[PDB]
Design a protein around this motif. Structure first.
Motif, PDB file in Angstrom:
ATOM      1  N   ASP A 102       0.827  -1.201   0.000  1.00 23.58           N
ATOM      2  CA  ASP A 102       0.000   0.000   0.000  1.00 23.58           C
ATOM      3  C   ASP A 102       0.866   1.256   0.000  1.00 23.58           C
ATOM      4  O   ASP A 102       0.670   2.159   0.815  1.00 23.58           O
ATOM      5  N   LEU A 103       1.825   1.308  -0.918  1.00 23.88           N
ATOM      6  CA  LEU A 103       2.722   2.453  -1.025  1.00 23.88           C
ATOM      7  C   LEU A 103       2.857   2.906  -2.475  1.00 23.88           C
ATOM      8  O   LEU A 103       3.018   2.087  -3.380  1.00 23.88           O
ATOM      9  N   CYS A 104       2.795   4.216  -2.688  1.00 26.19           N
ATOM     10  CA  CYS A 104       2.913   4.779  -4.028  1.00 26.19           C
ATOM     11  C   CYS A 104       3.996   4.061  -4.826  1.00 26.19           C
ATOM     12  O   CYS A 104       4.846   3.374  -4.262  1.00 26.19           O
ATOM     13  N   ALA A 105       3.959   4.227  -6.145  1.00 23.94           N
ATOM     14  CA  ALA A 105       4.939   3.597  -7.022  1.00 23.94           C
ATOM     15  C   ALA A 105       6.013   4.592  -7.448  1.00 23.94           C
ATOM     16  O   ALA A 105       7.186   4.237  -7.577  1.00 23.94           O
ATOM     17  N   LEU A 106       5.607   5.837  -7.665  1.00 23.80           N
ATOM     18  CA  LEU A 106       6.536   6.884  -8.078  1.00 23.80           C
ATOM     19  C   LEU A 106       7.683   7.017  -7.082  1.00 23.80           C
ATOM     20  O   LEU A 106       8.851   6.847  -7.436  1.00 23.80           O
ATOM     21  N   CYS A 107       7.343   7.323  -5.834  1.00 27.06           N
ATOM     22  CA  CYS A 107       8.344   7.477  -4.784  1.00 27.06           C
ATOM     23  C   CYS A 107       8.449   6.210  -3.941  1.00 27.06           C
ATOM     24  O   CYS A 107       9.534   5.662  -3.755  1.00 27.06           O
ATOM     25  N   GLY A 108       7.309   5.750  -3.432  1.00 28.66           N
ATOM     26  CA  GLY A 108       7.294   4.551  -2.615  1.00 28.66           C
ATOM     27  C   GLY A 108       7.016   4.848  -1.154  1.00 28.66           C
ATOM     28  O   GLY A 108       7.584   4.213  -0.266  1.00 28.66           O
ATOM     29  N   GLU A 109       6.141   5.818  -0.905  1.00 26.21           N
ATOM     30  CA  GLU A 109       5.792   6.200   0.458  1.00 26.21           C
ATOM     31  C   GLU A 109       4.417   5.658   0.838  1.00 26.21           C
ATOM     32  O   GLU A 109       3.738   5.030   0.026  1.00 26.21           O
ATOM     33  N   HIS A 110       4.013   5.908   2.080  1.00 27.10           N
ATOM     34  CA  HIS A 110       2.718   5.446   2.570  1.00 27.10           C
ATOM     35  C   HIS A 110       1.579   6.116   1.808  1.00 27.10           C
ATOM     36  O   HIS A 110       1.685   7.275   1.403  1.00 27.10           O
ATOM     37  N   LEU A 111       0.490   5.380   1.616  1.00 27.54           N
ATOM     38  CA  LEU A 111      -0.670   5.902   0.902  1.00 27.54           C
ATOM     39  C   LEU A 111      -1.885   5.980   1.820  1.00 27.54           C
ATOM     40  O   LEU A 111      -2.059   5.146   2.709  1.00 27.54           O
ATOM     41  N   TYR A 112      -2.724   6.985   1.597  1.00 33.69           N
ATOM     42  CA  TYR A 112      -3.924   7.172   2.405  1.00 33.69           C
ATOM     43  C   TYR A 112      -5.152   6.616   1.692  1.00 33.69           C
ATOM     44  O   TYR A 112      -5.085   6.223   0.527  1.00 33.69           O
ATOM     45  N   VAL A 113      -6.277   6.586   2.401  1.00 37.03           N
ATOM     46  CA  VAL A 113      -7.522   6.080   1.837  1.00 37.03           C
ATOM     47  C   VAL A 113      -8.161   7.105   0.907  1.00 37.03           C
ATOM     48  O   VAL A 113      -8.986   6.761   0.058  1.00 37.03           O
ATOM     49  N   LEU A 114      -7.776   8.366   1.071  1.00 35.55           N
ATOM     50  CA  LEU A 114      -8.311   9.442   0.245  1.00 35.55           C
ATOM     51  C   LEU A 114      -7.202  10.118  -0.554  1.00 35.55           C
ATOM     52  O   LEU A 114      -7.398  11.191  -1.123  1.00 35.55           O
ATOM     53  N   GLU A 115      -6.035   9.481  -0.594  1.00 32.70           N
ATOM     54  CA  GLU A 115      -4.895  10.020  -1.325  1.00 32.70           C
ATOM     55  C   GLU A 115      -4.370   9.006  -2.338  1.00 32.70           C
ATOM     56  O   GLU A 115      -3.720   9.372  -3.318  1.00 32.70           O
ATOM     57  N   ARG A 116      -4.655   7.732  -2.093  1.00 36.68           N
ATOM     58  CA  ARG A 116      -4.210   6.665  -2.982  1.00 36.68           C
ATOM     59  C   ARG A 116      -5.037   6.646  -4.264  1.00 36.68           C
ATOM     60  O   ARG A 116      -6.240   6.912  -4.244  1.00 36.68           O
ATOM     61  N   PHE A 153      -1.160   1.752  -6.676  1.00 38.96           N
ATOM     62  CA  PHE A 153      -1.591   2.996  -6.049  1.00 38.96           C
ATOM     63  C   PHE A 153      -0.561   4.100  -6.270  1.00 38.96           C
ATOM     64  O   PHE A 153       0.644   3.846  -6.289  1.00 38.96           O
ATOM     65  N   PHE A 154      -1.043   5.326  -6.436  1.00 35.45           N
ATOM     66  CA  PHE A 154      -0.165   6.470  -6.656  1.00 35.45           C
ATOM     67  C   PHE A 154      -0.659   7.690  -5.885  1.00 35.45           C
ATOM     68  O   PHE A 154      -1.849   7.815  -5.593  1.00 35.45           O
ATOM     69  N   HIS A 155       0.264   8.590  -5.558  1.00 40.29           N
ATOM     70  CA  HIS A 155      -0.077   9.802  -4.822  1.00 40.29           C
ATOM     71  C   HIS A 155      -0.762  10.816  -5.731  1.00 40.29           C
ATOM     72  O   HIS A 155      -0.384  10.979  -6.891  1.00 40.29           O
ATOM     73  N   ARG A 156      -1.771  11.496  -5.197  1.00 37.46           N
ATOM     74  CA  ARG A 156      -2.511  12.493  -5.961  1.00 37.46           C
ATOM     75  C   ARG A 156      -1.558  13.482  -6.628  1.00 37.46           C
ATOM     76  O   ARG A 156      -1.867  14.042  -7.680  1.00 37.46           O
ATOM     77  N   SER A 157      -0.402  13.692  -6.008  1.00 33.01           N
ATOM     78  CA  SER A 157       0.593  14.617  -6.540  1.00 33.01           C
ATOM     79  C   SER A 157       1.476  13.928  -7.575  1.00 33.01           C
ATOM     80  O   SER A 157       1.629  14.412  -8.698  1.00 33.01           O
ATOM     81  N   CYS A 158       2.057  12.796  -7.191  1.00 32.71           N
ATOM     82  CA  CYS A 158       2.925  12.039  -8.085  1.00 32.71           C
ATOM     83  C   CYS A 158       2.243  11.796  -9.428  1.00 32.71           C
ATOM     84  O   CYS A 158       2.770  12.164 -10.479  1.00 32.71           O
ATOM     85  N   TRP A 199      -5.999  14.171 -13.321  1.00 36.09           N
ATOM     86  CA  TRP A 199      -7.225  13.955 -12.561  1.00 36.09           C
ATOM     87  C   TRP A 199      -7.950  12.702 -13.041  1.00 36.09           C
ATOM     88  O   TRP A 199      -7.810  12.276 -14.187  1.00 36.09           O
ATOM     89  N   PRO A 200      -8.744  12.097 -12.144  1.00 36.46           N
ATOM     90  CA  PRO A 200      -9.507  10.884 -12.455  1.00 36.46           C
ATOM     91  C   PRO A 200     -10.647  11.151 -13.431  1.00 36.46           C
ATOM     92  O   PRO A 200     -11.804  11.272 -13.032  1.00 36.46           O
ATOM     93  N   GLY A 201     -10.312  11.240 -14.715  1.00 42.76           N
ATOM     94  CA  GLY A 201     -11.320  11.492 -15.729  1.00 42.76           C
ATOM     95  C   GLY A 201     -10.790  12.326 -16.879  1.00 42.76           C
ATOM     96  O   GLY A 201     -11.474  12.517 -17.883  1.00 42.76           O
ATOM     97  N   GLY A 202      -9.566  12.824 -16.732  1.00 43.90           N
ATOM     98  CA  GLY A 202      -8.967  13.638 -17.773  1.00 43.90           C
ATOM     99  C   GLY A 202      -7.594  13.141 -18.179  1.00 43.90           C
ATOM    100  O   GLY A 202      -6.666  13.931 -18.355  1.00 43.90           O
ATOM    101  N   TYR A 203      -7.462  11.826 -18.327  1.00 44.20           N
ATOM    102  CA  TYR A 203      -6.190  11.224 -18.710  1.00 44.20           C
ATOM    103  C   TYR A 203      -6.406   9.850 -19.336  1.00 44.20           C
ATOM    104  O   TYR A 203      -7.492   9.279 -19.248  1.00 44.20           O
TER     105      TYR A 203
END
Ligand code: ZN
Ligand code: ZN
Length: 82
Positions: A16-30, A37-42, A53-57
């Motif tokens: 349950d850790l982002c792929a870009l960096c590899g840090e902890h992920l949240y339930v509303l950030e993953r 899973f990826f960070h909203r920023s990454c 954004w979820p719908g424009g990619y």
């Protein structure tokens, strides 16, 4: 080489850790993308690194990456256009 060295102590943790960096992920950030899973920023474009954004990619099939709807490539094939 040839040597007798085996005995390291390391760990990774739950998957349950982002792929870009590899840090902890949240339930509303993953970002559930193909199981990974990826960070909203990454999570961004590969040419403009713009927050995808979820719908424009879209994830181009060819290579297998994620690009915006403005940079997303497209399989190349005989144009045979008139
Ligand atoms: Zn990340
Ligand atoms: Zn882009």
């Amino acid at each position: 080489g040839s040597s007798g060295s085996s005995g390291q102590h390391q760990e990774a943790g739950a998957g349950d850790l982002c792929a870009l960096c590899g840090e902890h992920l949240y339930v509303l950030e993953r970002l559930c993308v193909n199981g990974h899973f990826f960070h909203r920023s990454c999570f961004r474009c590969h040419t403009c690194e713009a927050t995808l954004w979820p719908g424009g990619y879209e994830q181009h099939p060819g290579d297998g990456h994620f690009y915006c709807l403005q940079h997303l490539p497209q399989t190349d094939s005989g144009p045979s256009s008139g």
